Design a protein around this ligand. Structure first.
Ligand SMILES: Nc1ncnc2c1ncn2[C@@H]1O[C@H](COP(=O)(O)OP(=O)(O)NP(=O)(O)O)[C@@H](O)[C@H]1O
Ligand SMILES: Nc1ncnc2c1ncn2[C@@H]1O[C@H](COP(=O)(O)OP(=O)(O)NP(=O)(O)O)[C@@H](O)[C@H]1O
Ligand SMILES: [Mg+2]
Ligand SMILES: [Mg+2]
Lengths: 344, 390, 163, 73, 98
DNA sequence: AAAAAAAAAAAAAAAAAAAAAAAAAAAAAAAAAAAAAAAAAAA
DNA sequence: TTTTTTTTTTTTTTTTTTTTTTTTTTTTTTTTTTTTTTTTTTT
């Protein structure tokens, strides 16, 4: 509780320190405190009868019990921030501290769900194994929680990947899959809020599209839903843009990359399922719950989305210049756009 | 300002004309069972307007004295307070019932309901919101309220409920326009394909139709975005104020430092459309769902939520009616200490209680006693308590 | 045979209820009326402090009065045909000390038939008890054991502090 | 019953002056807060059982008490 | 009939609750500080003898186990021993256990 | 001659209620392993 | 009367399939209110 110790830890854990042994040492201090306190509490409770007759009935102490909680509330936030470190030992120790905290319920769980989700995409297997197991335990007790922090999850995930360098976050979808409302909402949120009119970084769009194509599906309702809304937005937005370009430019480069990425996602989906355009246009949202219950057949080795999307990102890659070659690439992009709108 | 005094006549077991004494900053209303004090709270709940079902009597005619026994007393009733704020003026609200109907009066001038309401809203009493009247069993209920009702309350208090019909009407308009644009686009595409397979008039028809539909869609889009932005901004302001203050308030009220309370929404892009939930941690225990917690923590949690909601937008007074239903002497002492430490310069608070540890800290008492008759006729008499030690 | 049994037991329960409730409240009276009939419901008519003019219905009463009515009904149905054991949790919270004395004396008389477990936070209700208990909550677990009348009567009222 | 003990206190407090008027301010003249509240509440619970009739004129003023029907004399 | 005593392990906040000196016949009042956990006693007594409690969702069953410290339990058990000396309960013994 | 008080009919509202579709815990069935018990033999 | 292998019966466990049941809006109905409409009284 002392002020100097407080400021000491809250400076070492933050402030972009050169040392990486101080941070490891701090996290190890917290970890050993938590473990030792837990063991002491348990093994001191086990032998009650020797001291029972000499303890009050009207007191019900808390300062010996609540203390272990209070401590965390002074440091917790900083520890969570330490997930975004380039070293690996720091990340491992931070995850150990959080997984010792939560397993005694000391702190409120749904404020450290997003970080615990973005920790689901590390290379080392033991890391994300521990993380995902912690997540399924957080869910199995409390039904709602994960649905509250789902998009912030992916945002933190993308920040983690840009700090380090199937689907990376497929597990999250497996957890949120069951409920029709939840799933539907989540999909619409991510899609409508990231591609249509948000000036998001051209890399986050790539990442979202990669994850939208990779996701494990176990019915037929989901890709048809995605395709349907994709259709509507593509139609309106693309039509407006292309017709204004015909009436008539880096802004075009940006919005064109957006719509093109969305196009290629649609095409990869349609090729991975091989569904007839008639069936797609026939389907409407909430037509019936049980009609599209068939398991989607998958053609082997049709994954061309990664290569294709990287090719079309290499076409742009935030490259605007006062040179003839980019103008040529842009006119080809426009003719390609006409071809895309002509796809049948 | 505050609530100076009220006046009853024939209303719900208060025969004759009598003046309830002037109210100090923090009073208490003691008395033995069946004396009829909690309906005095109903009296306060009747001036400010309240649906009859919450007044624990059907049909609104059984308010007049002596109806539940079988013989009424008159065909009138007359309840009226005198709100007094700084500036040496005094306003007198009333609400008289005749036959079945009810008429409202301000300063002995007949008015219509809407202006009466708006006058109260000017004062600061969101009558339909009901964030400051607690009935006997309501306090426990507030903590366990289903998320939907809590969203309803938070939308009511914050003036973001009036903008509903406009919003979803705009929503339906834009969804229809978008569907029709897609329809026309695909029809034009298939007509183009059937043309290339080889008609002209149909092509131009669907083209012009698609153009008109697009224009209407764009007309719907920005307007929907405008109204949704409005509702979101208002709701979000109110909600963030409540959240920060509930955390601080709960820590202060439990006189500990290991308690948390998280007031969190679902669907955090449009919080007004989905239920909000409330999870609190005990003073010295683990995180458990709200249902599991014992009654003693439940009542402190509900008190925390009430005080936070009030601490966003002020309300001149409370009416607490037996909040100490289940609290032990220590917890009641803590709650009473907080009420005393807050009551001076923040809000007037009038409580009904039985445990002497709650009306001992009080500063002015109002005894309420019965008298035998054709029906139990109640009467009132006051007592000062700021001329005594400890 | 079923209809006949219904009739006789309703009669006995009606009489016992009128007796108990006349005893609990110092002054008043109440009875159980059947509905139209086959039968469809049982209504209750209660009156006190006027004793002849008053004839009430249920929704407009007090905490103490409602709790007294309910307790009267339960004690009646006990006095007709005893049940294995009764467990009361925080029964006395709404009512006042005078009624609490009445309820405790009725418990004291009725004890000799069935087993009674109950909790409370006010002294009067343990005016009549065989053996008390306590519940201590240390190290995030709760234990239960026997205690003596002195420490219990002290904990219930005698101390008023932060511990 | 503490209440009837205080009732005996009332009987003896009245039989000394005989002006059939037990004032409350005097009976609480030299006490602390808790016992003052207790005494006031005791007057109320006594008035319930008709054993005493009490009078109050002004909104904030002393209480004047006098024996009623069931004083038991 | 006459509840002799109760045994609880891992139910709601009772880790390991061995035997207690037996109840009486007349009146056994329980007191305890606010939030101590007296109501869980009656929830045990009702969880065994009354069917209504066991109509909950699987989540509630998962949440009806002492999750305090150390490992997490999986097998809770509540036992009640009472004596039908008056042979009110038909199966003839002196202390029926359930 | 015209303001006022008082009952009655029409209209908005709200709570009991009739209805339908997605979901979910539960009951029934079937196969395999295991565990207690009867039968000829026997000590 | 009591022990043993072999056979016979019970029962127990674990999946898959059917079944009641809870919920989830949506719609309908009915009582309450209240505003207007209708009807004598009086200054
Ligand atoms: N309209 C009425 N006219 C006359 N008496 C009534 C009326 N409504 C209720 N009562 C009775 O008058 C008393 C008022 O009840 P109530 O106001 O609830 O008392 P109380 O203040 O709650 N008692 P308590 O909470 O125990 O201190 C009760 O006896 C009612 O039965
Ligand atoms: N499954 C559980 N595991 C661990 N602790 C639990 C569990 N369920 C409840 N608790 C806690 O155990 C305590 C139970 O309190 P409870 O048994 O309701 O006491 P109480 O005596 O009724 N309080 P009061 O209202 O004064 O009577 C609370 O602190 C709960 O949060
Ligand atoms: Mg009350
Ligand atoms: Mg309790």
């Amino acid at each position: 509780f002392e002020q100097e110790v407080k400021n000491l830890y809250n400076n070492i854990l933050s402030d972009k320190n050169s040392s990486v042994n101080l941070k490891i040492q701090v996290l190890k201090n917290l970890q050993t405190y938590l473990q030792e306190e837990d063991t002491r509490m348990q093994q001191a409770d086990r032998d009650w009868k020797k001291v029972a007759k000499q303890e009050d009935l009207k007191e019900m102490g808390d300062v010996s019990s609540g203390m272990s909680s209070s401590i965390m509330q002074l440091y917790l936030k900083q520890v969570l921030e330490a997930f975004f470190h380039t070293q690996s030992s720091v990340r491992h120790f931070a995850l150990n501290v959080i997984a010792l905290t939560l397993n005694q319920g000391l702190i409120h769980p749904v404020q450290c769900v997003p970080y615990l989700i973005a920790m689901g995409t590390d290379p080392e297997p033991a890391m994300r194994n521990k993380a995902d197991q912690q997540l399924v335990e957080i869910d199995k007790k409390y039904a709602g929680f994960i649905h509250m922090k789902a998009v912030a999850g992916m945002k933190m995930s993308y920040q983690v990947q840009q700090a380090i360098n199937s689907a990376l976050c497929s597990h999250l979808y497996s957890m949120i899959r069951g409920n029709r409302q939840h799933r539907r909402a989540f999909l619409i949120s991510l899609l409508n809020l990231f591609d249509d009119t948000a000036k998001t970084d051209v890399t986050m769009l790539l990442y979202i599209a990669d994850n939208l194509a990779c996701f494990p599906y176990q019915t037929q309702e989901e890709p048809l839903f995605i395709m349907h809304h994709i259709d509507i937005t593509l139609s309106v937005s693309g039509s407006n843009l292309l017709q204004s370009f015909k009436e008539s430019l880096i802004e075009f480069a940006n919005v064109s990359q957006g719509i093109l990425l969305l196009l290629m996602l649609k095409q990869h989906l349609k090729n991975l399922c091989g569904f007839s355009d008639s069936k797609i246009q026939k389907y409407s949202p909430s037509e019936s719950a049980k009609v599209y219950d068939k398991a989607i057949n998958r053609k082997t080795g049709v994954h061309f989305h990664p290569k294709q999307t990287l090719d079309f990102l290499r076409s742009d890659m935030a490259n605007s210049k006062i040179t003839e070659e980019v103008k040529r690439s842009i006119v080809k992009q426009y003719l390609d756009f006409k071809l895309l709108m002509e796809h049948l | 300002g505050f609530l100076k005094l009220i006046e009853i006549e024939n209303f719900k077991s208060y025969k004759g004309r009598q003046i309830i004494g002037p109210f100090q900053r923090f009073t208490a209303i003691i008395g033995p069972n069946g004396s009829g004090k909690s309906n005095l709270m109903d009296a306060i709940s009747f001036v400010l307007g309240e649906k009859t079902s919450n007044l624990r009597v059907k049909t609104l005619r059984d308010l007049i004295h002596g109806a539940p026994v079988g013989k009424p007393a008159a065909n009138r009733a007359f309840v009226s307070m005198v709100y007094s704020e700084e500036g040496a003026e005094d306003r007198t609200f009333a609400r008289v019932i005749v036959g079945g109907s009810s008429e409202y009066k301000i300063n002995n001038k007949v008015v219509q309901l809407h202006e009466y309401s708006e006058e109260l809203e000017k004062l600061g009493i969101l009558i339909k919101a009901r964030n400051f009247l607690v009935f006997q069993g309501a306090v426990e209920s507030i903590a366990m309220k289903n998320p939907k009702e809590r969203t309803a309350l938070f939308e009511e208090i914050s003036r973001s409920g009036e903008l509903a019909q406009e919003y979803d009407k705009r929503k339906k308009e834009m969804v229809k326009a978008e569907e029709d644009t897609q329809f026309n686009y695909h029809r034009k595409k298939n007509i183009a394909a059937e043309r290339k397979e080889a008609v002209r008039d149909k092509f131009q028809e669907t083209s012009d139709e698609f153009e008109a539909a697009r224009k209407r869609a764009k007309k719907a889009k920005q307007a929907f975005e405008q109204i949704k932005k409005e509702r979101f901004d208002r709701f979000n302001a109110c909600f963030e104020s409540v959240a920060t203050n509930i955390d601080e308030i709960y820590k202060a009220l439990s006189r500990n430092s290991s308690a948390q309370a998280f007031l969190g929404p679902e669907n955090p892009e449009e919080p007004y459309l989905d239920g909000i939930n409330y999870n609190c941690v005990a003073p010295g225990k683990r995180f458990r769902p709200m249902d599991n917690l014992s009654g003693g923590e439940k009542t402190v949690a509900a008190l925390a939520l009430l005080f936070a909601i009030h601490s966003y937008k002020p309300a001149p007074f409370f009416v607490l009616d037996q909040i100490d239903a289940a609290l032990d002497n220590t917890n009641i002492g803590k709650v009473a200490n907080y009420i005393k430490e807050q009551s001076t310069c923040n809000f007037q608070a009038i409580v009904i209680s039985l445990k002497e540890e709650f009306y001992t800290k009080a500063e002015s008492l109002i005894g309420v006693y019965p008298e035998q008759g054709d029906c139990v006729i109640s009467k009132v008499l006051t007592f000062d308590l700021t001329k005594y030690p400890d | 045979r079923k209809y006949e049994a219904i009739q006789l037991t309703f009669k006995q329960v009606s009489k016992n209820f009128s007796e108990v409730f006349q005893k609990l409240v110092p002054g008043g009276k109440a009875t159980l009326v059947m509905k139209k009939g086959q039968f469809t419901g049982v209504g209750i008519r209660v009156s006190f402090t006027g004793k002849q003019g008053e004839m009430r219905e249920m929704q407009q009463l007090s905490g103490g009065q409602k709790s007294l009515v309910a307790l009267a009904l339960i004690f009646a149905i006990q006095k007709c045909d005893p049940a294995p054991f009764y467990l009361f949790d925080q029964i006395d919270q709404a009512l006042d000390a005078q009624h609490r004395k009445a309820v405790s004396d009725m418990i004291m008389e009725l004890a000799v038939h069935a087993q009674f477990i109950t909790t409370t936070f006010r002294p009067e209700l343990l005016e009549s008890a065989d053996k008390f208990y306590g519940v201590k909550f240390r190290n995030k677990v709760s234990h239960i054991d026997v205690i003596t009348a002195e420490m219990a009567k002290d904990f219930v009222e005698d101390d008023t502090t932060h511990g | 019953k503490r209440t009837q003990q205080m009732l005996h206190g009332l009987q003896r407090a009245l039989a000394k002056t005989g002006a059939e008027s037990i004032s409350l301010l005097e009976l609480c003249r030299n006490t602390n807060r808790k016992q003052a509240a207790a005494k006031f509440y005791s007057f109320l619970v006594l008035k319930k059982q008709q054993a005493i009739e009490l009078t109050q004129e002004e909104p904030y003023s002393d209480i004047i008490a006098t024996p009623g029907p069931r004083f038991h004399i | 009939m006459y509840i002799k005593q109760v045994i609880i392990q891992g139910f709601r906040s009772y880790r390991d609750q061995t035997i207690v000196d037996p109840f009486s016949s007349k009146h056994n009042v329980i007191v305890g500080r606010n939030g101590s956990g007296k109501s869980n006693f009656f929830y045990a007594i009702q969880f065994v003898l009354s069917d209504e409690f066991s109509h909950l969702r699987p989540e509630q069953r998962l949440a009806l186990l002492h999750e305090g410290t150390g490992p997490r339990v999986i097998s809770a058990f509540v036992e009640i021993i009472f004596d039908n000396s008056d042979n009110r309960l038909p199966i003839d013994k002196e202390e029926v256990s359930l």
